[PDB]
Symmetry: C2
Subunit: 319 residues, 2 copies
Amino acid sequence: MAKIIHTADWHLGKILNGKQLLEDQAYILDMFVEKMKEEEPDIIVIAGDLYDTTYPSKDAIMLLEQAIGKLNLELRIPIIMISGNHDGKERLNYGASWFEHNQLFIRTDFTSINSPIEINGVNFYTLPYATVSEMKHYFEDDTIETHQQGITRCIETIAPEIDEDAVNILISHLTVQGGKTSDSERPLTIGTVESVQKGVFDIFDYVMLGHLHHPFSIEDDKIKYSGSLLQYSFSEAGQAKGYRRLTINDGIINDVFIPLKPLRQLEIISGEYNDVINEKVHVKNKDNYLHFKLKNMSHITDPMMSLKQIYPNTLALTN
Amino acid sequence: AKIIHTADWHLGKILNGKQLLEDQAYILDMFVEKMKEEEPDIIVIAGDLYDTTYPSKDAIMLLEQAIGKLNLELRIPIIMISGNHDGKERLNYGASWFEHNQLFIRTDFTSINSPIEINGVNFYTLPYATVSEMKHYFEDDTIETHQQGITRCIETIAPEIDEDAVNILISHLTVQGGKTSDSERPLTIGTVESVQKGVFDIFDYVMLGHLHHPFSIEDDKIKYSGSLLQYSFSEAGQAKGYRRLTINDGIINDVFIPLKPLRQLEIISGEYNDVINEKVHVKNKDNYLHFKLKNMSHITDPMMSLKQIYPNTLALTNE
Ligand SMILES: [Mn+2]
Ligand SMILES: [Mn+2]
Ligand SMILES: [Mn+2]
Ligand SMILES: [Mn+2]
């Protein structure tokens, strides 16, 4: 009878068209920590992609240490944290041996799936992201060529020792077949297929995932993505983002999505140039991050920073 | 009451275009092997752990592994002062979780007013700070020297102190008349960065760092650990290691214990012919060498020919 919070894809330190989202990401984490006080969850899982790069800025590392500190030290919520494809494993893994004392777990090794973490009588199976090279070389299997082959092979390590009488939840970072895609995700593959099938996770009672930034990328009773904390591309402009709440109520699993409201959103406006700089066009919020696809090709003086006096946080201009 | 005194690791240090991390991992390995022998009460690292404020992934992993063996595997308390070279936020990352295993990281110079006491000995922490940073905390224009800011620092703890107790100061600065090395940076912007030994007269002992010669200062109360390795050909032939401090009912005794490196820095003189025919005395052919030779004629690439027989040659000078 526990309450589990499922988030993923923080992508701290991300830059969109030369603009830093750290001012925004600090705001959305303020709201994340604020509503976690009201929930008082039994555990939080962060299903990968915490940093946008393998070389996070001094300011971005501060942000993670501060947010994770409030959640785990002063709110005293246990945390499970796996790595993603963007993540720098060792930069994320730093100091993990001291963190385990206060129930803060970090996993950057797909080998760790054989070692599940048990919180509130629930078994969490962690499987950080791994490429197929580094997967096929641990198993020494040369017939591992697609992401699914290596992922299924990882689960056959743990399938015989798994406990069927408890609640087994898999935390991973991968692409499920049939999920919608945004342009804030990098491809995991070269010319192979990166998607894993639904039947791979038949053993697990539940699957908490991250990689696809759309929260409703996969509609399923057993498998579900958290989605990104914010809109990280204009493909997701306007769509709601946030976190997911999962409650196991005496063997009855229920999941719901809770939206978060950002400091500003991403919006796309099409129309005439003189309609938008003369403010004869409707905009939901003129402080938004904006992509302008406009008319009148000839642009007297600078086209864009004439628009920046009206709309300060404009990012791209297409014509 | 046995204390280990070390400083100036400068992890990630580059010397003449080569990373010294392979050497530093060997000397840190030998340091904790000698920490298994000497069962110590405290290990003190008086600053300058990294070489820049943005260390590489491998350098960060080395500090985590080394510190981990000391604090966790061997259950040794550690105190970490911030030096003039390393970044304060990268050094204190996760310091809140580390205090539960008695691992103390101080990067704030205003932290001197809250000493750490273990085994009946009080440790006052004075991480490095600049006069522009020290000027703003006290809102004083009196302090334009580095010495006055330190005097200002100790005056905070001067009323709040027990002269009865063993009071040790850990800091990172320059003492008057101390010997210099070329791998050290200037601490101020073109003034006098040195401090007289009278400022530290309220303390029973001063453990310092910044000056890489173990015997920079010859004084009973103020001593320098010195750098882990020779980080410049100015330090060629200098013994390096750590200081051991033993206390028994108020009487302090100090020793210097040297670590023998995998490689040394030698400056070799002679002629190209004798040197390449191995008839000039070289301690170890594997050592890092700077050659001042005199055969300025017949050799195609004199460095490559030299590297054939002396692999770790670093610099060549001809006369
Ligand atoms: Mn992602
Ligand atoms: Mn991803
Ligand atoms: Mn220094
Ligand atoms: Mn130094």
